[PDB]
Amino acid sequence: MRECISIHVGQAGVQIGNACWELYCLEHGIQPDGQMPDDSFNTFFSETGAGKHVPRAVFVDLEPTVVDEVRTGTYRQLFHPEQLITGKEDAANNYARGHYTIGKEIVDLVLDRIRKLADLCTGLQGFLIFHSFGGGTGSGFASLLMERLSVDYGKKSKLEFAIYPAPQVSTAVVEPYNSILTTHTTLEHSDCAFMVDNEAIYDICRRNLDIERPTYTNLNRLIGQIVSSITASLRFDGALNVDLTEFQTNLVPYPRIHFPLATYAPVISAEKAYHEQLSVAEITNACFEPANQMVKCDPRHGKYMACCMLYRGDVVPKDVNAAIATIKTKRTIQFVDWCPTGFKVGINYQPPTVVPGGDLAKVQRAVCMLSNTTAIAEAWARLDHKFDLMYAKRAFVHWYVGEGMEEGEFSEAREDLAALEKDYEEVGVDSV
Amino acid sequence: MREIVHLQAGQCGNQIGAKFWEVISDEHGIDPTGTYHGDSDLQLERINVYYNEATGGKYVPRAVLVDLEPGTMDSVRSGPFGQIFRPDNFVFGQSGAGNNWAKGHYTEGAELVDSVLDVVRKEAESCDCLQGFQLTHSLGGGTGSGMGTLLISKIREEYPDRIMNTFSVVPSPKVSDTVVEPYNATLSVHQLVENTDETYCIDNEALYDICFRTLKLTTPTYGDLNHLVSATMSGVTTCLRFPGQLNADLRKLAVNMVPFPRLHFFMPGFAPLTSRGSQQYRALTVPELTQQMFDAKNMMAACDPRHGRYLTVAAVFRGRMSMKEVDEQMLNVQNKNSSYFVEWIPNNVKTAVCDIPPRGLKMSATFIGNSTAIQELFKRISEQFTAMFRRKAFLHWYTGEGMDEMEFTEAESNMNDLVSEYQQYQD
Amino acid sequence: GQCLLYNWEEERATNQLDQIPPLQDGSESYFFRHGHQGLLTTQPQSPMSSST
Amino acid sequence: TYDDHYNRHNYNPGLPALRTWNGQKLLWLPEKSDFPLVAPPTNYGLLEQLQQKWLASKTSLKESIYTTSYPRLPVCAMSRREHAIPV
Numbered sequence: 001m002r003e004c005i006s007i008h009v010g011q012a013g014v015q016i017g018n019a020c021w022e023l024y025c026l027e028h029g030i031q032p033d034g035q036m037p038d039d040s041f042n043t044f045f046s047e048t049g050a051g052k053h054v055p056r057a058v059f060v061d062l063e064p065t066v067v068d069e070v071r072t073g074t075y076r077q078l079f080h081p082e083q084l085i086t087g088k089e090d091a092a093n094n095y096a097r098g099h100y101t102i103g104k105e106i107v108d109l110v111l112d113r114i115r116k117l118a119d120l121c122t123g124l125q126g127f128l129i130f131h132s133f134g135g136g137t138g139s140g141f142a143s144l145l146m147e148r149l150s151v152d153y154g155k156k157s158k159l160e161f162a163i164y165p166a167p168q169v170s171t172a173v174v175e176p177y178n179s180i181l182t183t184h185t186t187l188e189h190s191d192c193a194f195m196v197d198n199e200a201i202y203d204i205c206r207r208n209l210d211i212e213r214p215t216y217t218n219l220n221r222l223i224g225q226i227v228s229s230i231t232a233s234l235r236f237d238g239a240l241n242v243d244l245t246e247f248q249t250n251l252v253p254y255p256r257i258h259f260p261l262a263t264y265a266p267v268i269s270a271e272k273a274y275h276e277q278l279s280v281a282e283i284t285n286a287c288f289e290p291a292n293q294m295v296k297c298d299p300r301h302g303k304y305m306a307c308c309m310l311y312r313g314d315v316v317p318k319d320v321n322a323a324i325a326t327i328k329t330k331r332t333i334q335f336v337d338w339c340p341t342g343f344k345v346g347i348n349y350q351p352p353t354v355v356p357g358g359d360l361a362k363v364q365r366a367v368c369m370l371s372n373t374t375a376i377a378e379a380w381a382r383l384d385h386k387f388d389l390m391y392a393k394r395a396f397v398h399w400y401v402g403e404g405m406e407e408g409e410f411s412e413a414r415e416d417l418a419a420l421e422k423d424y425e426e427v428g429v430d431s432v
Numbered sequence: 433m434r435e436i437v438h439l440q441a442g443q444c445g446n447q448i449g450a451k452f453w454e455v456i457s458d459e460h461g462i463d464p465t466g467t468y469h470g471d472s473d474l475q476l477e478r479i480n481v482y483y484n485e486a487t488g489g490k491y492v493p494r495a496v497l498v499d500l501e502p503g504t505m506d507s508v509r510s511g512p513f514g515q516i517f518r519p520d521n522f523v524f525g526q527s528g529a530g531n532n533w534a535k536g537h538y539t540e541g542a543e544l545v546d547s548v549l550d551v552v553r554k555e556a557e558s559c560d561c562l563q564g565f566q567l568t569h570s571l572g573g574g575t576g577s578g579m580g581t582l583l584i585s586k587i588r589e590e591y592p593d594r595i596m597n598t599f600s601v602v603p604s605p606k607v608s609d610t611v612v613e614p615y616n617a618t619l620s621v622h623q624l625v626e627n628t629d630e631t632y633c634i635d636n637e638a639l640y641d642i643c644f645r646t647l648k649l650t651t652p653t654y655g656d657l658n659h660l661v662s663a664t665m666s667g668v669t670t671c672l673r674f675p676g677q678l679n680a681d682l683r684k685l686a687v688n689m690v691p692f693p694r695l696h697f698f699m700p701g702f703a704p705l706t707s708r709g710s711q712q713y714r715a716l717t718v719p720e721l722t723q724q725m726f727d728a729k730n731m732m733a734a735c736d737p738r739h740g741r742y743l744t745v746a747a748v749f750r751g752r753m754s755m756k757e758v759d760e761q762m763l764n765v766q767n768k769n770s771s772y773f774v775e776w777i778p779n780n781v782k783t784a785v786c787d788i789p790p791r792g793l794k795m796s797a798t799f800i801g802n803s804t805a806i807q808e809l810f811k812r813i814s815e816q817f818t819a820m821f822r823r824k825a826f827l828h829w830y831t832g833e834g835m836d837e838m839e840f841t842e843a844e845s846n847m848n849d850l851v852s853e854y855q856q857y858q859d
Numbered sequence: 860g861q862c863l864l865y866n867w868e869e870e871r872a873t874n875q876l877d878q879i880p881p882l883q884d885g886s887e888s889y890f891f892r893h894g895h896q897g898l899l900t901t902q903p904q905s906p907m908s909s910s911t
Numbered sequence: 912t913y914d915d916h917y918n919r920h921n922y923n924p925g926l927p928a929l930r931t932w933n934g935q936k937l938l939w940l941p942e943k944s945d946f947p948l949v950a951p952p953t954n955y956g957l958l959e960q961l962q963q964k965w966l967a968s969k970t971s972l973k974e975s976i977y978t979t980s981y982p983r984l985p986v987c988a989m990s991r992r993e994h995a996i997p998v
């Protein structure tokens with residue numbers, strides 16, 4: 001039976017895990033202690049002998065504090081004590097710490113736990129990995145774990161949900177280094193990536209949800225909504241059930257092109273929802289507006305390559321069809337020459353549930369979009385500009401060389417992502 | 433005696449297949465338990481064409497349900513007619529195809545086809561005189577377009593004489609729900625042409641047009657679409673099941689309908705489509721059927737027959753009627769629309785009559801048509817195929833499976849050669 | 860469809876023929892996912908004609 | 912914060928259930944992003960655990976480890992011996 005394994009690494013990974021596992025327990029109806037007081041429920045929660053279910057996730061962080069918070073929270077009796085792994089010292093915004101000297105102490109322990117989890121599961125659909133490019137742990141440990149995971153399981157899909165550093169705001173200063181040098185792992189040992197920044201979701205929450213002062217949990221609930229919308233087709237029934245492999249094939253044209261764009265709709269509050277009538281046409285029109293991307297880039301300056309639409313609830317194929325036809329009859333939205341058909345529709349029946357104290361209103365229907373498109377080339381163009389502007393003066397390099405990595409890989413990484421954006425320009429070229 | 437084996441693959445074929453077994457269980461009067469609760473004798477005389485005898489007055493469908501993912505097998509088991517299907521008839525895989533034609537046809541379908549071949553051989557040996565095989569699947573999936581089109585290659589080698597027809601679901605150009613869709617179809621059409629006696633190309637778009645206009649339902653779900661496909665599935669085989677004034681079978685039309693084994697693609701239609709609101713106000717005669725079935729808006733495929741020439745036409749009538757204006761209206765449509773027929777085949781209309789009506793309707797009719805306009809749909813795939821292929825996009829999924837590059841070229845060469853010689857038969 | 864708009868003819872024609880959710884179901888699509896009962900076999904309570 | 916959100920389920924009795932307008936502050940006046948609940952703080956058994964861990968130190972606990980390790984067992988905890996040979 002289909003099973004997905006969660007690989008949450010870093011402080012961000014642990015927090016998104018908190019939100020997503022809260023939503024999973026709620027939607028399946030699981031008590032926080034671990035008891036059950038159509039749906040599949042086996043894909044995430046695994047039975048034990050005493051009639052108690054244990055989540056299929058691994059939380060790894062090189063600082064013990066954030067994991068200890070969950071160890072002393074409400075869900076202390078839900079996660080397996082072996083599942084959550086800690087380190088005494090962190091990487092502290094250093095790829096070299098996260099990759100070359102600190103990770104190797106606990107790599108084998110993490111791999112043993114993952115091996116046990118894979119032996120418990122029968123049919124593993126794939127590995128969903130949550131991390132961030134900025135953090136030392138979230139970059140380095142994810143990179144080494146992914147490169148070992150690739151040789152351990154050659155055919156298992158390895159999906160990434162990653163927090164990209166924002167275009168303007170930053171929680172640190174040395175992050176362009178780590179975001180640049182995690183690209184080799186995320187380019188060759190990956191299948192699809194789901195880069196998000198915090199700035200765009202800040203804007204979307206301020207603008208539509210009316211919460212003027214969002215905090216991190218306001219983002220984490222939205223990310224949990226994203227992942228539940230993704231895996232609803234594994235969880236429940238529907239007319240058109242879709243799978244991880246289904247959308248990997250319908251979303252990756254070339255091996256170097258595996259960075260779709262995340263988008264969610266409708267994202268509004270109760271006062272909005274009570275008087276605004278939500279139709280499939282309106283939600284699909286909102287999901288295409290550039291003011292509704294999770295990442296800071298305008299698709300109007302890029303070109304769409306492929307789209308996965310995931311509808312859920314009281315959704316009807318005919319109004320989906322009218323929505324898609326209306327979307328296609330637009331000069332403003334553009335598609336490449338070699339993709340005459342570029343939509344994959346998946347349908348689920350169970351409407352999205354609501355976390356108490358949340359922000360989204362109770363909606364009958366929901367949609368999610370995963371858009372592989374070329375407008376994200378500018379994001380790494382800005383990243384390359386800032387990386388060169390700092391590396392030209394050899395700033396902060398002594399930390400890395402002292403931790404024990406060599407310096408030619410700096411230029412190697414810069415050349416790598418320059419080649420990436422060159423290939424994206426190649427694809428953006430049209431054969432007219 | 434004259435038995436029919438229904439092959440069932442993929443999310444598509446499993447759903448309409450369950451829908452098809454729902455319709456014919458109603459007509460023959462079986463409850464979902466398995467007992468015969470019909471009234472007439474003629475309901476139960478030739479039940480053994482689809483149904484296999486079981487102890488205790490039970491009847492089991494003689495169908496083989498396959499899917500590379502186990503989720504649908506729980507769903508069909510959880511349907512209305514869910515318990516009627518034999519647990520051994522469920523053969524299922526753990527990993528889905530990913531809309532990948534290559535994965536279902538060579539990678540993982542290879543290990544499972546022996547399990548499907550096992551049950552079919554026992555299925556074949558159970559019936560005394562099998563009339564042929566029947567398969568419902570999707571040309572745009574990964575299982576039916578993939579592994580299913582592989583099963584066709586094996587059984588045809590195993591059973592040459594028997595007649596097999598595919599109630600396949602073609603993609604529409606106006607609406608699609610898969611980016612890699614032209615890859616599997618172009619890799620599917622190359623296989624059906626080689627070994628298939630006649631093919632009923634079903635379009636999902638025209639069905640939505642039908643329920644919007646002809647039936648004017650506000651929210652027809654997929655189940656209604658499967659019913660109209662299920663209606664056609666029973667309509668073709670009715671003269672086999674029941675007595676008629678002039679009977680027919682799957683060979684009586686397949687022999688009568690194809691002048692050349694290459695030209696085997698068909699366009700199936702259903703006659704009595706009237707809205708629920710004005711059922712009591714409807715008049716039911718031969719003329720209004722003929723005006724209904726030959727209209728292009730009634731059609732279930734995405735080609736306008738006015739843009740092509742009708743080569744051959746087969747129509748099977750359901751309902752106790754007599755033949756005189758049944759024969760006369762076929763002449764009226766022939767001489768009036770003389771331009772829309774080809775001239776080297778005189779009297780190109782084939783009629784067949786069965787005595788029994790369906791439940792709740794005194795009359796039915798099913799139209800099976802070979803037209804030039806079916807060639808237009810194939811060119812629409814090639815225009816989509818070449819544009820994606822010229823950039824070699826989405827190809828490493830197929831490349832990384834051990835496939836070569838030339839199979840994309842030969843399949844393109846085949847159907848281009850098909851529409852080349854199909855076009856010369858228009859002129 | 861008490862309001863007269865957008866196929867209110869058919870809506871009021873089958874106002875009660877289709878609307879029977881027994882207060883547990885909260886979605887007509889989920890209730891009628893299998894297919895609409897009242898289609899092409901109106902008053903479906905007539906057996907086969909025994910006349911040959 | 913984690914205790915406020917995940918442990919407490921945002922349990923703020925003083926906060927109103929819904930939001931309304933404010934006139935001059937052109938906003939929706941209630942806002943859960945500020946005005947936390949400041950109830951009894953984040954607590955659990957660790958206080959008493961540490962209190963016992965250091966209270967059970969200064970005792971005149973002369974005794975052999977044998978006698979402090981092997982007491983008289985309850986008659987309730989004896990084995991029931993379900994599976995046995997004779998009738």
Ligand SMILES: Nc1nc2c(ncn2[C@@H]2O[C@H](COP(=O)(O)OP(=O)(O)OP(=O)(O)O)[C@@H](O)[C@H]2O)c(=O)[nH]1
Nearest residue numbers: 010011012015090091092093134135136137138171
């Ligand atoms: N959306 C979101 N982003 C987060 C969250 N927590 C951390 N981040 C991101 O994570 C980045 C910093 O990495 P951290 O997780 O704090 O540190 P680390 O990954 O463990 O690496 P080290 O600091 O070396 O231990 C910041 O730039 C944030 O953008 C969160 O709860 N939600």
Ligand SMILES: Nc1nc2c(ncn2[C@@H]2O[C@H](COP(=O)(O)OP(=O)(O)O)[C@@H](O)[C@H]2O)c(=O)[nH]1
Nearest residue numbers: 442443444447448570573574575576577609654
């Ligand atoms: N008409 C009709 N089409 C269906 C039904 N179920 C699925 N489909 C079509 O099947 C296609 C997807 O098939 P898929 O599951 O990928 O087939 P598989 O990969 O071979 O198992 C979609 O484009 C749907 O339009 C149905 O019940 N009726």
Ligand SMILES: [Mg+2]
Nearest residue numbers: 011090135137
């Ligand atoms: Mg950290």
